[PDB]
Structure 1
Amino acid sequence: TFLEHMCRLDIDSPPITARNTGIICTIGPASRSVETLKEMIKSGMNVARLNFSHGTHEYHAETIKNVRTATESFASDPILYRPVAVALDTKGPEIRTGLIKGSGTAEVELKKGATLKITLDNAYMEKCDENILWLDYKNICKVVEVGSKIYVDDGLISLQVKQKGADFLVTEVENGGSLGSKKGVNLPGAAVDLPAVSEKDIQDLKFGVEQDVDMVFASFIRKASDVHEVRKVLGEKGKNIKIISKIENHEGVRRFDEILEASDGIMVARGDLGIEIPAEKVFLAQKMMIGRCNRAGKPVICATQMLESMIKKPRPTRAEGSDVANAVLDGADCIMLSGETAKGDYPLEAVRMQHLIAREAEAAIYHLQLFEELRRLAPITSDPTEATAVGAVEASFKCCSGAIIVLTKSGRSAHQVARYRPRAPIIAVTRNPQTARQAHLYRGIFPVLCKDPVQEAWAEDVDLRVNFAMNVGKARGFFKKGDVVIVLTGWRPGSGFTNTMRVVPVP
């Protein structure tokens, strides 16, 4: 009984299992130094997120350089080295207002009920007033109708369409407040037809490919074709880069299935969604998307103001503490920190609290129960790897194994085991550096980069990689000698196929 499960939760019983959820940290002026980055990695950071909404390429190249400098600082000890991925989060397509009467700093607020006209006439670009407002979205009138709502400046200001002019709109200020220059606009429920990527996104994406980033968090994704566009721009040289689509508006939620199908992962951007749809429905959207991603076996990331308050506070608010725990309880693969680590004054404490909350939340989940539903909703397959994966997870529960060791080149086999959410951690051993880093996208996977040189005979090379995982598992305290672990590898060498599962006692 679930209710009976809740009743049995105990705060006095320390979490036993390791923290399965990945932690993604936005890097900025307050966590940019190799020094701080080293600590953040020790504190649990698995992915470094660079927010391209701001900063120059040279600025970001140096951030990435420092991240790799700090990461390789631990390579002298292969057994403890933790791969650290680099994520590029695009500024993305957006609608900005013009400049209010000359200068930008100048603000012209207006009272509710008042009238306000939205003009596409470029003549009013740098001359916006409490009576006339210029926007850079040229199809604004075609995707909106009389009665539509329009938010200005991150939803701070609200408006409602009364009459649809030709190249303009007349609206009543439902809300109010200080209106500034070049502010972001949102069209709740409207099918915005802006290109999938902006011209700035294009160059940033190209930069990402040359910087060899592991994933891209693509903004404002609202249809499959938007994902394809992002994919096309990354091109042949960026084909292995994971594309995580950020669901930020109503159309994105409505066409979520086709978007998920086309993506490698998903990110619930509660911040923008909170503007785009009724704030009271965001928790529903988040839970729906996490659930579908878990069902599909694709990574899902939760972020957008998790532990915000921790900018100048030692500990998080109660709402934030609850939010991170429930996100992981919902089934999120990774939790992301923004601002709290990019700016703030407590970047380290923020990462540590994130880690603590996650492991507590994970200890409070009924793993066997979560797995039964996954296998239940999962269909009959003819793919031997899928069958091997489910059998390994089951065998793992039966002997309460210290881990499921998975040898993988591309990471696929490890991902297949991860979708079934075993309780035991998944130690994915690979010689591919990129696979090691990208693995953090999947909950429960603990990637380890095997340094040792390949062995002539495939059989010996397999034992070498398996024993490496064994030492890692021992070192990290996942298990010890005498315990039992599950191992997934292949039957023969040059044929490729993870269809072999072995139950082996730890040396």
Structure 2
Amino acid sequence: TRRGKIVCTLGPATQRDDLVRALVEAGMDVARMNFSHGDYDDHKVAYERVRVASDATGRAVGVLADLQGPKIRLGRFASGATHWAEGETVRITVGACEGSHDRVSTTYKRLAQDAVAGDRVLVDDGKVALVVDAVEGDDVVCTVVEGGPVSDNKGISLPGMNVTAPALSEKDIEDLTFALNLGVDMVALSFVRSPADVELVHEVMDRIGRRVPVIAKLEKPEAIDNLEAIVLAFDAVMVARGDLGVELPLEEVPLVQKRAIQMARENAKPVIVATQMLDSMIENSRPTRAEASDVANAVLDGADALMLSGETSVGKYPLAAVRTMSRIICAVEENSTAAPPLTHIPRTKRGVISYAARDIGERLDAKALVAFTQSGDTVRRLARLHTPLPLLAFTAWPEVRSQLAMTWGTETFIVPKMQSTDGMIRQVDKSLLELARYKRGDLVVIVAGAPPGTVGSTNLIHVHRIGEDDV
């Protein structure tokens, strides 16, 4: 079965009974809750349906809260949706209005004040493009230069305009709070522009008394300019290609994607590739050849996880989207799990030990690699190496199981907090022997550490035959 992980975004199309359950059954490893949409009630209900389906099927499902950040947006249209055709004049106003085809609000109140004739305005990640002709008091008068359909509250991007807005708005802070309290496993922050942005997420987490891993979404040039610092200061990154493809030239995105994946794997941080991977399946039961390709090449790039957005959130074929993405990933993986090699020899204890664990298990044809982890680190350092062998993480902290749902190749087992490595090893046998997949005598390679229950104590590798007296 599949090694590459699948993130799905929840929405209107997953709101009906036991759709969430079908998604998990079809392979969803992480549920994304997008805080740009929905009411708190909708997010509670969805969260609850994910815990039910995860617990009831036995499959790990991480819940990731996506914070809107400083996303600039349109207001409402009287019709909910209009066509912006090439040649038309449109006003985007910071004043209040009855929104119509000709005149629509925006949430960015400095827009009239900061826009300059010549500026370009991409709507909805480029389904429409406009050029600013003038600013008349509150209105930015523009010409539609590339036409297309626009609708309520779609995003706008103003490439190069250097936008003033908090890294976390009042709304983001409250959504973060509600999400921490509800119990989510990870938090993603939109529009990261600095490694220091994670500090602000941590400040809130600490007031509230609870931290989880933070994912930087990469969709700003400033973020790509600071890629390594951001990969080091955050716990994960998402290549957020929708907005990245209008914040930067769309032609630069594929190499940015590839670099950012490599940078994540170099430093053992999960990385998610997001947005329009199967875009056409919003309306169609099968994807284009470019989509299938895009997904396969994200696998070969070495991405831990691929994400579906509108394909599951508002689309007509959410389940098929998930199964399809799963089939393409598996097709690549049946061929090879190899990823671009790392450009350094590991230097950290946990990196050096995990690297060696992998060598041992592959050279002996072990049935599995097994690694004990309290924070996930030791397992992340092995996962990044890719390996055809099962990579089975063991932990006593259930949150780590949900967190590891976004890490390549990794299934997790929860066991009691043990006071010794012999104890860790007995638990391995006990857990695996209750599975079909393992029987007594099977060869496994186990990484563990003492002093027990201490992050970063990893210090042993143990070649072990299940149940046999080799400890």
Q: What TM-score bracket applies, with the shorter chain setting the length?
A: 0.7 to 0.9
Q: Tell me which residue corresponds to 2:373.
A: 408
Alpha carbons of 1:291 and 1:127: their partners in 2 closer, same or farther (altered >3 Å)? same
Return 5+ residue gaps in structure 2 as ranges. none
Pair 1:286 & 2:257 matched: yes
Q: Where do 5+ consecutive residues of structure 1 fail to align?
A: 1-17, 75-80
Q: What do residues 401-424 of structure 1 show as CA deviations (whole Å, max 9, x unaligned)?
A: 222111122222212222333332
Distance 1:104 1:257, change over 3 A: farther
Change (3 A) 1:138 1:427: same
Asked if 2 retains the 8 angstrom alpha-carbon contact of 1:429 and 1:469, the reply is: no
Answer yes or no: is 1:89 the counterpart of 2:66: yes
Which of these residues, 377, 385, 396, is aligned with residue 361 of structure 2? 396
Tell me, in whole angstroms, the C-alpha distance in 1 between the residues paired with 2:443 and 2:235. 33
Q: In 2 relative to 1, CA 132–53 (structure 1 residues): closer, same or farther, beyond 3 Å?
A: closer
Match of 1:175 in 2: 146
Equivalent residue letter for 1:424: L
Give the one of 443, 451, 461 matched to 1:501: 461
Contact kept in structure 2, 1:110 and 1:130, CA below 8 Å:
no
Cα offset, 1:159, TM superposition: 3.2
Matched, 1:471 2:433: yes
Which of 446, 449, 456 aligns to 1:490? It is 449
Q: Tell me how far 1:115 sits from its aligned partner.
A: 6.3
Matched residue type, 2:449: G
2: distance between equivalents of 1:182 and 1:38?
Answer: 30
TM-score, scaled to structure 2: 0.87
Superposition deviation, residue 236 in structure 1: 4.6
- 1:355–1:156: structure 2 CA closer, same or farther, 3 Å change rule? closer
* Between 181-190 and 398-407, the greater mean CA deviation after superposition: 181-190
Contact 2:30/2:62, CA 8 A, preserved across alignment: yes
SS of the aligned residue for 2:14 comes to: coil
Indicate the residue corresponding to 1:43 in structure 2: 26
Give the match's secondary structure for 2:122: strand
Alignment partner of 2:407 out of 433, 442, 453: 442
| C-alpha contact 1:34 1:70 (8 A) present in aligned 2 | no
- The whole-number CA distance in structure 1 between the counterparts of 2:258 and 2:51 is 34
Residue of structure 2 in register with 1:316 after alignment: 287
1:450-484 CA-partner distances (Å, limit 9, x unpaired): 2xx556x6255212322145336x53x4x655442
Instruction: Quote the offset at 1:290 in angstroms.
Output: 1.3
8 Å Cα contact 2:433-2:440 kept in structure 1: no
Deviation of 1:443 after TM superposition, in Å, equals 0.6
Alpha-carbon contact 2:220-2:248 (below 8 Å) kept = yes
The whole-number CA distance in structure 2 between the counterparts of 1:93 and 1:426 is 38
Q: Which residue of 1 aligns with 2:420?
A: 458
Task: Tell me the CA shift for residue 145 of structure 1.
Answer: 5.5
Alignment of 1:67 onto 2:53: no
One-letter amino acid of the counterpart of residue 462, structure 1: M
Residue 498 of structure 1 and its aligned partner are, at CA, apart by 1.0
Distance in 2 (CA, whole Å) between partners of 1:261 and 1:169 is: 40
Assess, with a 3 A threshold, how the Cα gap between structure 1 residues 255 and 104 changes in structure 2: closer, same or farther. Answer: farther
Could you tell me how far apart the structure 2 residues matched to 1:127 and 1:285 are? Answer: 40
Secondary structure of 1:286's partner?
A: helix
> Of residues 176, 186, 192 in structure 2, which corresponds to 1:205?
176
CA distance in 1, matches of 2:372, 2:276: 36
Q: How far apart are residue 389 of structure 1 and its match?
A: 1.5
Per-residue CA deviations over 1:149-183 (Å, capped at 9, x if unaligned) read 22235433323356688877665543345666654
Q: Is the 8 A contact 1:486 1:502 kept in 2?
A: yes
Q: Is the 8 A contact 1:310 1:340 kept in 2?
A: yes
The aligned residue for residue 190 of structure 2 is 219
CA distance in 2: counterparts of 1:137 and 1:69, whole angstroms: 39
Does the CA contact (< 8 Å) of 2:177 and 2:208 recur in 1? no
Task: Answer whether contact 2:125 2:245 (CA < 8 A) is retained.
Answer: no
State whether residues 82 and 447 of structure 1, in contact with CA within 8 Å, keep that contact through their aligned partners in structure 2. no
Equivalences for residues 200-349 of structure 1 within 5 A: 200-237=171-208, 239-311=210-282, 313-349=284-320
Is the CA contact 1:83–1:448 (under 8 Å) kept in the aligned structure 2? no
Stretch deviating more after TM superposition (211-220 or 162-171): 162-171
Q: Is the 8 A contact 1:265 1:300 kept in 2?
A: yes
**Quick one: structure 1 residues 95 and 431, their matched pair in 2 at CA, closer, same or farther if it must change by over 3 Å?**
same
State the Cα distance separating 1:435 from its structure 2 match. 0.6
Identify if the C-alpha distance between structure 1 residues 471 and 357 changes in structure 2 by more than 3 Å, giving closer, same or farther.
farther
Q: Distance in 1 between matches of 2:112 and 2:389?
A: 54
Residues 139-178 of structure 1 mapped to structure 2, 5 A cutoff: 139-140=110-111, 147-161=118-132, 172-176=143-147
Give the counterpart of 1:377 among 344, 347, 351. Answer: 344
Q: Which amino acid aligns with 1:88?
A: A
The residue type equivalent to 1:240 in the other structure is R
**Change beyond 3 A, Cα 1:62–1:295:** same
Distance in 1 of aligned mates of 2:465 and 2:60: 27
Shift of 1:214: 0.4
Alpha-carbon distance, 1:434 to partner: 0.2
Residue 344 (structure 2) pairs with residue 350 (structure 1): no
For each residue in 1:29-58, what CA deviation from the matched residue of structure 2 results, as whole angstroms up to 9, or x when unmatched? 443456333333232221122222221111
Specify the code of the residue in structure 1 equivalent to 2:423.
D
Give the TM-score normalised by structure 1.
Answer: 0.81
User: Judging changes above 3 Å, is the alpha-carbon distance between structure 1 residues 361 and 143 closer, same or farther for their aligned structure 2 residues?
Assistant: farther
Deviations 1:342-377 (A, max 9, x none): 34344333322222211221233363xx47x32x42
Checking the alignment, whether the CA contact within 8 Å between 2:86 and 2:144 is kept in structure 1 is: yes
Larger radius of gyration: 1
Structure 2 CA distance, aligned partners of 1:211 and 1:435? 17
Looking at structure 1, the residues matched to 282 and 443 of structure 2 have their Cα atoms a distance apart, in angstroms, of: 44
Distance 1:41 1:232 in 2: 33
Does the Cα contact within 8 Å between 1:188 and 1:250 map onto a contact in 2? Answer: no
Deviations 1:130-153 (A, max 9, x none): 877654424446766664322235
Contact 2:429–2:466, Cα closer than 8 Å, also in 1:
no
The answer to whether the 8 A contact 1:89-1:216 is kept is yes
1:207-259 deviation line (CA, Å, top 9, x unaligned): 10111100112112222233332332333546431111111233332332332
